[PDB]
RNA sequence: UUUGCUCCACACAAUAUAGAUGGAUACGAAUAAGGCGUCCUUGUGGCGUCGCUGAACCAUAGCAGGCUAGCAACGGUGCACUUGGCGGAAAGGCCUUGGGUGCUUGCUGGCGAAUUGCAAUGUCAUUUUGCGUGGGGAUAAAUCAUUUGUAUACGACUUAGA
RNA sequence: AACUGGCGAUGCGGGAUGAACCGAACGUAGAGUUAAGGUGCCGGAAUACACGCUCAUCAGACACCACAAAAGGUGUUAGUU
RNA sequence: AAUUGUUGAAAGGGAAGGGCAUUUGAUCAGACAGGCCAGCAUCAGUUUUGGUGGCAGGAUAAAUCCAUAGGAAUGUAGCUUGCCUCGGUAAGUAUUAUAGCCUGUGGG
């Protein structure tokens, strides 16, 4: 949807005479700005409680900065998505350095692999994976072997002028 | 008669691999690969160079042939301490790569007169060498 | 899903020296020398010790990694093909007309001249591939034997003969005539 | 000595245009060795000259010049728009043009 | 930037070379392309052979003369790719095309001239490794181009006379490199060292 | 719609345009593949069609109902007095095809060939080749270099020869001149051969022997403007038809809305170049021979 | 038919120009590899080194580059000559010998520059043709008409004619 | 047939092309900024950046729009139990 | 007037003619004696593109950094064991030791 921020959002059915101080419910929402994030908040709240923006009220809307933004983390991600033929539940695993960075690339993968646009996707849970060997998918497990190294063959260097008088070399 | 099988010895993505940034507010600065995120992202940190610890796409950086003993995941202070230890900056500064860089930085900073001064010197150097290229 | 590194081992015997610049392989052992071009295939060879060589694929998909093993195999068969060598035995079969095979030569050629196939008046010829020797086995009836260092040159010179004797316009389950490969193996015995 | 050039070499690319309508009032100039917008903001305001020859002598010369000025940058590749006392003649598309160093500011 | 730009066609992807050659033309830049027969095309040989036959079947029904014209030679194949990217029925288009010459092999003049290469059309830099491609001289030969053997013959000879050229040249730069060494450490030298030279 | 009854087209499309040929002497568009192991001689000869006659012979065809029996067969007779060699021409291979780089000529040129280079012999000063003839005067110098260039280069060697047309009943004087590829060993031998034969003469038997299969290459007799019926062998339209019946009724369908190339129209018939092959030589007569 | 034609030279004139303005600066090949230097056992060799762009390399100071003196070098470069050699893919260009001559900013001197007035491309490229001058060289043909008939609606084709 | 908006009566930018779609409604002009739609070359405008996917011996390529289905695949990709 | 001849000028690769614009050629008005045009400077209106300074919010950013307690493994030192060209490997113990990392709390 853009580059993502993560918000804590809090709202509560409008106070009534006979029921003042209603319950307060929170969601963590991944959106690109605070306006979309409250649109989203209300989107899901109406999928659980009887409320709608018209009869409720946001109480607090707060960015949640990554606690350890240079600590490489193995994330497990849980997602609901509709495909063309129907609607399904997935679990993927993203190895990035901050929840917000990873939710970003999830959305890329869903779009690339399963053609799911943003509207069709429900993040259900994103959480850090504490022990290794709770990592399931192998496209992550690769990157947790000990003393790991790898080269980057066939190096291509972006030419700056239209012509060239050498003849390139993909060496690295 | 032994076997004799080529080589192809690549620079590697690995912890403690020093890496020349090429685009950003760092760009032209060295830095080291702390941990390793995936096939295309890495975690770099170059506290000596002033470049901040970050996750960087490997496309915006170029692997140098320098390496040093660095524990995977090592924080910035640890990085600063191991870097100085291996004496990275001298190791790089003295290399034909980093000298060629400084050499063109200089030719860019030449004043119009200094540029005129280079011409006469080359005139002088050429006179004696074109001579020597005729006596042996 | 792009596997980061996978390699295979190419074991090397005492009587052989393989040499690989770019991906042009040359193996020389007792039986002689074989060379094979691998430029089409994008793998990384790495010596470890005159009895061991490795081939690797970095960041490769299925279709690529799946081509890694078959590079090993190919170089293996070059190695064995030059120590032991290869020997393919085929045995004529016919239901009434004796298939009549010989080795004819027009212009230093060496051919495999099959006559009377299914009683044909036609004279079939298969060319003898350089690197393969054809002996007609003594002590066994209607046998032919192709031997050489190149598996691929023998198995083919083999197969080109069996196919020159395909049976047209008859029920090929009843009319089993032909020449068929009956045993594929090495040249040096015990092994 | 051998060189005397006090200008930067140039090329008359197109008029300013849409897909299907051009505007002869603005030429688009390609300045040799200027490759980004940031590079080409140096040349903004420099005077341009398109020198050309003719058969009729005039003020005692057979050489004539249409004068202009770089006025703004164009796109991302250091192309530059410019206007002239009289629009450039559309045959000049691909001709050489002279971008001078004045009004300087060094 | 230079009066003429000689492009060694070898190793470039047709439409990408055609595309930069086209623009260069229209911007006033004279260009000759050499070694058009060592040009490349993405996709394997058979696809591009078929593709060529599709092109080959179009012609003016009532008179196969007036209809489209199917040139076989790798240069002309290339020219077609190239003319397709120029407003070639305008005067300006004909203007620009005259600034262009395509050649099989490297004939006189341009064999002594240095030829350059176009990184953004270089196949070895462009095509994903593992992709299949096509050589233009092979393609051209399968569709009636006559002269693939004569060109390779003349080229092999030309490469022989050029390997000598290089060899003599590398021998002489060894003197110059040795001369410049004794002049190093001198006063001129460390002064120029200072000024970046 | 669809024909009605299918039937094959009239005429062969690989002979268009059915126009007049550019010259009486049809061109040899091809010469035999060269075998540089044999002696060198000509690969084609020049003659004049004289007439036809009948021949009787025993046929030797084991299996045919006419084995060992007499047949009568028709044969043409070509008048064939020795061609006289007067030049060699060397060709080099180029990526744009075969190019001729030089031609060395004999020093002495018959008025027959010299006539060929003129349109008005009688009035002309006949200075043709006279300055070339000088080139021999000096030692030889320049003729050698050219002859030497030809050996140095040239993938192909051909010989300019011309006919002794005055040894022929014709009224026509102006002789015929033509290149003939030489197919014997070694480039250098071929030019050596031709230089040796300048002004000298060459005979038919040294090209053709008995029972050899040779091809003929001439210009079909001409008939001028020709209707569609005889020219293309089109059906005559019925008798009842208005405005003529040696026509083609339907010139074409409505679309493509043009008459097409593949449709027989009237036009020139004859004076076409033809390369006829596989004509066996039954007799190589010698003139000095009652 | 009014001294015509051609190649070299200069002179004046015209007429051009898809667009000079320091230099188109020559291996080949590979790219999951190579260039260069070096050593050897001359190899699919040992060792070293380089790349990460031509941001190079070469040239570049002097009335658009004037007039002049000297030194140190024996080098460089322009020009016309001459020795030997190479190049046919469109070679029409490349290399080498020897003297003659100009320049040299390698370094050190004498003189000059203004008033083009505070900018006005400020004119220095190369196209073709034309007219006389004189230093070499050369002295035809085709067409109408006539004629053949291997050709032809007419043109055209193919013949013949001191 | 219904409600609105349009074309008809209407040019201008886009959709190559096109009455009705998208954008936007017109006095004569200058400077600027945009819409819809674009920016390899034709063609003004990043052979821009980023993560995936796809190799098709009839690949695919942007609304209206110039068509394709049931059913299959041990091609490859991520998923579910 | 259509249309035609001559002369002069000019253009013409499957029509011609038209719009905006400019080169070139031809042609002509007016104005100078403040007329035509420019250049720079200081301003005014509109606008475009840079450099740089002072501040406000947030978990009074989150981090890094330092201090502290705890912890584990893609286990660093040591130790043990087993081969193994005199140590190097491998598999065991082993949580800071001859690397370090993670987590919480506190400070600026
Ligand atoms: Mg929402
Ligand atoms: Mg809802
Ligand atoms: Mg949903
Ligand atoms: Mg780029
Ligand atoms: Mg190497
Ligand atoms: Mg510089
Ligand atoms: Mg059957
Ligand atoms: Mg049957
Ligand atoms: Mg244009
Ligand atoms: Mg524009
Ligand atoms: Mg104007
Ligand atoms: Mg134009
Ligand atoms: Mg143009
Ligand atoms: Mg131009
Ligand atoms: Mg057509
Ligand atoms: Mg085209
Ligand atoms: Mg043009
Ligand atoms: Mg590539
Ligand atoms: Mg039918
Ligand atoms: Mg019937
Ligand atoms: Mg032919
Ligand atoms: Mg021929
Ligand atoms: Mg019979
Ligand atoms: Mg000649
Ligand atoms: Mg006549
Ligand atoms: Mg007739
Ligand atoms: Mg008749
Ligand atoms: Mg007939
Ligand atoms: Mg009737
Ligand atoms: Mg009929
Ligand atoms: Mg027709
Ligand atoms: Mg022009
Ligand atoms: Mg070369
Ligand atoms: Mg070499
Ligand atoms: Mg090397
Ligand atoms: Mg070497
Ligand atoms: Mg030796
Ligand atoms: Mg060697
Ligand atoms: Mg080596
Ligand atoms: Mg260089
Ligand atoms: Mg001077
Ligand atoms: Mg002086
Ligand atoms: Mg002296
Ligand atoms: Mg001197
Ligand atoms: Mg030639
Ligand atoms: Mg040429
Ligand atoms: Mg020549
Ligand atoms: Mg001199
Ligand atoms: Mg000078
Ligand atoms: Mg001047
Ligand atoms: Mg004269
Ligand atoms: Mg007379
Ligand atoms: Mg509407
Ligand atoms: Mg209405
Ligand atoms: Mg209306
Ligand atoms: Mg409207
Ligand atoms: Mg429009
Ligand atoms: Mg639109
Ligand atoms: Mg459309
Ligand atoms: Mg829209
Ligand atoms: Mg709408
Ligand atoms: Mg086009
Ligand atoms: Mg553009
Ligand atoms: Mg950009
Ligand atoms: Mg298709
Ligand atoms: Mg099909
Ligand atoms: Mg079909
Ligand atoms: Mg296609
Ligand atoms: Mg749709
Ligand atoms: Mg389906
Ligand atoms: Mg599937
Ligand atoms: Mg499911
Ligand atoms: Mg036409
Ligand atoms: Mg006008
Ligand atoms: Mg007055
Ligand atoms: Mg006034
Ligand atoms: Mg003015
Ligand atoms: Mg202002
Ligand atoms: Mg600020
Ligand atoms: Mg603060
Ligand atoms: Mg503690
Ligand atoms: Mg460590």
PDB file of C-alpha atoms and ligand atoms in Angstrom, chain F residues 10 228-229 233-238 245-250, ligand 30:
ATOM      1  CA  UNK F  10      -1.353 -23.180 -67.285  1.00  0.00           C
ATOM      2  CA  UNK F 228      -2.862 -15.771 -74.206  1.00  0.00           C
ATOM      3  CA  UNK F 229      -3.917 -19.014 -75.883  1.00  0.00           C
ATOM      4  CA  UNK F 233      -1.743 -22.849 -73.496  1.00  0.00           C
ATOM      5  CA  UNK F 234      -5.100 -21.571 -72.320  1.00  0.00           C
ATOM      6  CA  UNK F 235      -8.400 -23.135 -73.369  1.00  0.00           C
ATOM      7  CA  UNK F 236     -10.083 -21.568 -76.363  1.00  0.00           C
ATOM      8  CA  UNK F 237     -13.327 -20.015 -75.198  1.00  0.00           C
ATOM      9  CA  UNK F 238     -16.497 -21.324 -76.890  1.00  0.00           C
ATOM     10  CA  UNK F 245     -12.254 -16.234 -77.767  1.00  0.00           C
ATOM     11  CA  UNK F 246      -8.491 -16.672 -77.514  1.00  0.00           C
ATOM     12  CA  UNK F 247      -8.723 -15.000 -74.128  1.00  0.00           C
ATOM     13  CA  UNK F 248      -8.966 -15.846 -70.459  1.00  0.00           C
ATOM     14  CA  UNK F 249     -12.565 -15.335 -69.416  1.00  0.00           C
ATOM     15  CA  UNK F 250     -12.074 -14.423 -65.768  1.00  0.00           C
TER      16      UNK F 250
HETATM   17 MG1  LIG J  30      -9.326 -19.629 -71.053  1.00  0.00          MG
END
